[PDB]
Each structure stands twice: as C-alpha cells, then as structure tokens.
RNA sequence: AAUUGAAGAGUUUGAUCAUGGCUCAGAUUGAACGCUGGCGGCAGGCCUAACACAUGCAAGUCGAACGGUAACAGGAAGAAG
C-alpha cells in the first residue's frame, strides 16, 4: 500500500581537477492511493543508490490532499519556479490526463480522472513542486464551511 | 437529453535553472507520388490554361389560334388488268 514510482533520473557532472565526475539524480514520488503524496529527490554516484535515497526521502515529507470521490474538487493552479500548472476536477472526466511528471504524482496521489495542462517550464523537478503546491492549497467543502461559519 | 473538457518530448551547458527559437508525436484533405491490391455499400472526381476546340446530343411545343397538304394511312368518285 506504499505505491512508489520514479519519474526522472539524470546524469549531472562536477568538473574537478582531473577531468569530470558524473553523478546520478533520481526523482520519485510515493503515495498511498488516498491523499498522502510525497516526492523525493536524492542524488548519488550510481543509479540504484540514487533511487533508494529518493524513495527514502519521499516516504517522509509526505503531504495530505483533500480528495473528492476519486478526484479533485475545484480547479486549482499551482506554481513553482518557472513551472505553472493548471488542474481541473473533471467530475469523472475519465482517466488521468496530465503531462509527463504530473501523471505520476497525480497517479500515486490517488486521484483518477482530472484534466491538467502544465504551462511555462516543464522541468520534471519543478512540475511536481507545482502539483503538490496545487494539491496542498486545494481545500474541501467541509474546510471552507469550517472557515466561513457556514 | 441536447458542449464528459485541456498530456507532452528532443535539442544551447562540463553540469544547472530560466528565457527562447527549431523539431517531433495528433487530426484533416477535391490530394499527388511509391510499393501493394479481394469484394461490397455510400459519397467524391480539371484545384492548373476564364487556353483552343473535331464530332454527337444539351429547347422545344401547340392544328382545341390560322391559311394549308409536303409526306404516311384511310374515305368518296372515276378509269383499267
């Protein structure tokens, strides 16, 4: 019931004294399938150590999302660095139809059938960060009615 | 009951993030070309030279408008084997 999946692995470099030194970065997202989404970055010298650090950071640093029946509630826009992201609840608008690196976080998030369209930059490290910010500041009808009295 | 509706990716760098262009994945067509080709249904078929046109048809009808008889088939009368 953990439901982990990796989005992006890259080879970064460092350029020391004698030549270059190549390191690998993972970027994974875990989530239970009912709210509870996390992402982790993690970087290491080989690929399986990188993904393992990424999963291990992603299992902690996990955020609650106030889902609807199987989906979002109201249309929400989350931004991070250069990466602006729209989402629309699509009240059984079948299938998760999101961009790459947004399909994954929305998939393990437990949502099933939203409409997305990322704008701006679509770097995978910043398009999540713009989905969680997004799903984090999406509030439910029992939270809005809690705030404003009824 | 009559709008249930939105996906990205590759490429600037030793690597990064951003900006930014180029390019790809889709659908479409009065299409052409290449390879191949069994049947049917429904549609479509000179986008260019509003260039030049052989030949055949594409606008005739009415005698219940009229003088009339060129034919065709009868009618009447005459003459002949």
Curated annotation (Swiss-Prot):
Q: What else is known?
A: Altered uS5 proteins have been identified in a number of mutants. Some mutations in uS5 have been shown to increase translational error frequencies. Some mutants in this protein can partially suppress an alanyl-tRNA synthetase mutant.
Q: Which UniProt keywords apply?
A: Acetylation, Antibiotic resistance, Ribonucleoprotein, Ribosomal protein, RNA-binding, rRNA-binding
Q: Which domain of life is it from?
A: Bacteria
Using the record's annotation, list all stretches that form the S5 DRBM domain.
2-65
Q: Which GO terms describe its cellular component?
A: cytoplasm; cytosol; cytosolic small ribosomal subunit
GO molecular function terms listed in the Swiss-Prot or TrEMBL record: rRNA binding; structural constituent of ribosome
Q: What InterPro entries is this protein classified in?
A: Ribosomal_Su5_D2-typ_SF, Ribosomal_uS5, Ribosomal_uS5_bac-type, Ribosomal_uS5_C, Ribosomal_uS5_N, Ribosomal_uS5_N_CS, Ribsml_uS5_D2-typ_fold_subgr
Role played: With uS4 and uS12 plays an important role in translational accuracy. Many suppressors of streptomycin-dependent mutants of protein uS12 are found in this protein, some but not all of which decrease translational accuracy (ram, ribosomal ambiguity mutations). Located at the back of the 30S subunit body where it stabilizes the conformation of the head with respect to the body.
Task: Please describe, based on the UniProt annotation, the reported consequence of changing residue 103 to S.
Answer: In strain: NEA-319; neamycin resistant
- Give the family this protein belongs to, as stated in its UniProt record: Belongs to the universal ribosomal protein uS5 family.
Q: Specify the protein name.
A: Small ribosomal subunit protein uS5
Q: Which GO terms describe its biological process?
A: cytoplasmic translation; maintenance of translational fidelity; response to antibiotic; ribosomal small subunit assembly; translation
What does the entry's domain section say? Answer: The N-terminal domain interacts with the head of the 30S subunit; the C-terminal domain interacts with the body and contacts protein uS4. The interaction surface between uS4 and uS5 is involved in control of translational fidelity.
| Gene it is expressed from | rpsE
